[PDB]
């Protein structure tokens, strides 16, 4: 229960649609209400999974 | 070693490799000749087990300027054993050597690996005839660019005169001032004047009747 309470006390994530990927772990995402962005990936996700 | 390969051309017996390679058992710069008489006896067939040892031994290794000639000459012998299974491996040859070398290569690709297209066919078709100016209009001048301008030269190693004048004259226009005329002003017009050699007499392509060789190979392969 204490492990359940600490993980919920954490800022939420953003949802954004990937247009298409760049090279070397970079993509091209407009979120909803903003410009587009070139960001970095995490460990568990890959370029070929996009 | 080339006259050795011409004196033992065209037999897949693999005794000639046992003859030649055990005869010049030597240092590796003389074992440059290992790949010559190996595959000069291997003009054309399906012997894909040779084509993998034509890759897997000296594939890349990154090779800091020691046996870079041998991986070019190992790729030189990939050029034949491809020009007569009658187009079955020619599509596979242009698929591999377009992606693997000129894409993820180094000295093997960006210096020498275009002489396949100067050895595979001399007929001309816009697949490979347009894939070479993808790496020629991009001259990539940082190297000793007459490597890429050698690939300019026998890009016009396709006979049977064509509409390819659009490529050569327009590259000759950028080739007068830039791509300096001290070195290759002979070359671009050597490429220009060779397609219209005569009107006729363009059969230099080692295929008679339907598919037999008629060598032929002994006179071209020195160049």
């Amino acid at each position: 229960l204490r492990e359940e309470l600490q993980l919920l006390q954490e800022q939420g994530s953003y949802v954004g649609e990937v247009v298409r990927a760049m090279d070397k772990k970079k993509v091209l995402v407009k979120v909803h209400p903003e410009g587009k962005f070139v960001v970095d990936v995490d460990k568990n996700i890959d370029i070929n999974d996009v | 070693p080339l006259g050795l390969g011409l004196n033992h051309l065209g037999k897949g017996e693999a005794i000639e490799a046992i003859l030649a390679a055990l005869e010049v058992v030597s240092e590796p710069f003389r074992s440059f000749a290992n790949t010559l008489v190996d595959v000069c006896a291997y003009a054309g067939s399906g012997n894909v087990l040779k084509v993998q040892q034509l890759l897997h031994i000296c594939s890349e290794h990154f090779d800091s300027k020691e046996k870079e000639e041998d991986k070019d000459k190992k790729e030189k012998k990939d050029k034949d054993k491809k020009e007569a299974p009658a187009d079955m491996g020619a599509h596979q040859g242009v698929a591999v050597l377009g992606i693997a070398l000129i894409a993820m290569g180094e000295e093997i690709g960006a210096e020498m690996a275009l002489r396949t297209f100067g050895h595979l066919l001399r007929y001309g078709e816009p697949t490979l005839r347009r894939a070479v100016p993808l790496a020629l209009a991009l001259i990539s001048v940082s190297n000793p660019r007459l490597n890429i301008l050698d690939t300019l030269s026998k890009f016009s190693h396709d006979a049977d005169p064509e509409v390819s004048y659009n490529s050569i004259f327009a590259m000759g226009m950028v080739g007068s001032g830039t791509n300096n005329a001290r070195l290759a002003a002979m070359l671009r017009q050597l490429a220009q004047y060779h397609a219209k050699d005569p009107n006729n007499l363009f059969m230099v392509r080692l295929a008679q009747g339907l598919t037999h060789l008629g060598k032929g190979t002994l006179t071209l392969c020195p160049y």
Binding site: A21, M22, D23, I47, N48 | I99, M104
Partner: protein
């Protein structure tokens, strides 16, 4: 009484006939298409490299100066100024998207060049003016100033000896002889519409005067006037009719003004509302208060019936040049234009060809000239014969204009 399936009878089918090579040929095709995939993700060589210079020149900048241009450098914004007050700054400044502040000048400014309506560099924290700016120029009229010559000479607009004569009077002659209009006491018209059948030569007369203009010429893309936002298209009209007043005697060519407004109605309470606001803004900067002076407007359409009578009034569009079909002397001149630069027999006549194209346009005549050479490549020739053109007339016109009158013709001979 027809049923022929039961799970035991399924096993009859896939063992009868080539049990040797059925799966033996199939999974070879299956795993190679799997191998088409597994090469592609193993390559992964997409490489969208952009932005970077050649890496042999920026080495001096990105040693310390780039780190020196992070923290001391400023992320200041540009704004606009309403006014000022005496003895103090008391500067009133808007953004038009953010709020409106009342701020102070900084130390690095001269307090004279803080005139009203000026773009100024504004701090992010205390919002002080730092750097004044040159004024904004409109970005899309620069995109449509042509700065380029399309190569059509007046010798290619044959069959129109009088329509060019009307069009020469309005455009070319006051720009080169602005004397005889005043020295007799007349004024030239300032708006010319072009209307008629399609493919008749509307674009040619506009393309040929862009050659011989010696003046400012502005092509206007018609559907840039229609936008997504409300009132945005009307603002695009204004910036066009301001910079024309700055320089002297600039030409503005609209094209297909059928699209940007043809009729003003409201019965279903709605519809093309935003299109009307842009279209009526075009009218009030065409006539009204502040007449424009030396701005000449050319328009061209294919459907002139469906246009607004507010544009049909002279004073906005003054000369109605129409294009018709060339009778015979026009067409015989057109064949000599479009077939002089092609390998033909040097003895053929063209007046026989101009007979057989009774109701035809300049586009249809050129299509006959291109098609006749295509018959020469159907055979193996390098020059055109008389029967090459005669088959081309039947291919272009007679294959689509008539099918009952040619076989069952015997009412007319």
């Amino acid at each position: 009484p027809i049923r022929a399936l039961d799970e035991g009878d399924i096993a009859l089918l896939k063992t009868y006939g080539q049990s040797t090579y059925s799966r033996q040929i199939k999974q070879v095709e299956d795993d190679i298409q799997q191998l088409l995939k597994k090469i592609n993700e193993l390559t992964g060589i997409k490489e969208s490299d952009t932005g970077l210079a050649p890496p042999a020149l920026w080495d001096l900048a990105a040693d310390k100066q780039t780190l020196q241009s992070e923290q001391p450098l400023q992320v200041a914004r540009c704004t606009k100024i309403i006014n000022a007050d005496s003895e103090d700054p008391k500067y009133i400044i808007n953004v038009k998207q953010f709020a409106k502040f009342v701020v102070d000048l900084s130390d690095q400014v001269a307090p004279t060049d803080i005139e009203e309506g000026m773009r100024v560099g504004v701090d992010r924290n205390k919002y002080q003016i730092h750097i004044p700016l040159p004024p904004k120029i409109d970005p899309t009229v620069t995109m449509m100033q042509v700065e380029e010559k399309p190569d059509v000479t007046y010798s290619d607009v044959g069959g129109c000896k009088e329509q060019i004569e009307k069009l020469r009077e309005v455009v070319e002659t006051p720009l080169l002889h602005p004397e005889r209009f005043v020295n007799l006491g007349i004024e030239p018209p300032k708006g010319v519409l072009l209307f008629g059948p399609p493919g008749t030569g509307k674009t040619l007369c506009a393309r040929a005067v862009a050659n011989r203009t010696d003046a400012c010429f502005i092509r206007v893309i018609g559907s840039e006037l229609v936008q997504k936002y409300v009132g945005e298209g009307a603002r695009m009209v204004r910036e066009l009719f301001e910079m024309a007043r700055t320089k002297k005697a600039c030409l503005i060519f609209f094209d297909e003004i059928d699209a940007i407004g043809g009729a003003r109605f409201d019965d279903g309470a709605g519809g093309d509302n935003e299109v009307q606001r842009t279209m009526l803004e075009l009218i009030n900067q065409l006539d009204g208060f502040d007449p424009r002076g030396n701005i000449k407007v050319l328009m061209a359409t294919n459907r002139p019936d469906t246009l607004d009578p507010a544009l049909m009034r002279p004073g906005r569009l003054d000369r109605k040049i129409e294009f018709s079909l060339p009778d015979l002397e026009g067409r015989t001149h057109i064949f000599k234009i479009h077939a002089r630069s092609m390998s033909v027999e040097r003895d053929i006549r063209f007046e026989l060809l101009a007979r057989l194209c009774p109701n035809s346009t300049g586009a249809e005549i050129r299509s006959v000239c291109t098609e006749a050479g295509m018959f020469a490549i159907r055979a193996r020739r390098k020059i055109a014969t008389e029967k090459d053109f005669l088959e081309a007339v039947n291919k272009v016109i007679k294959s689509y204009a008539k099918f009952s009158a040619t076989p069952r013709y015997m009412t007319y001979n």
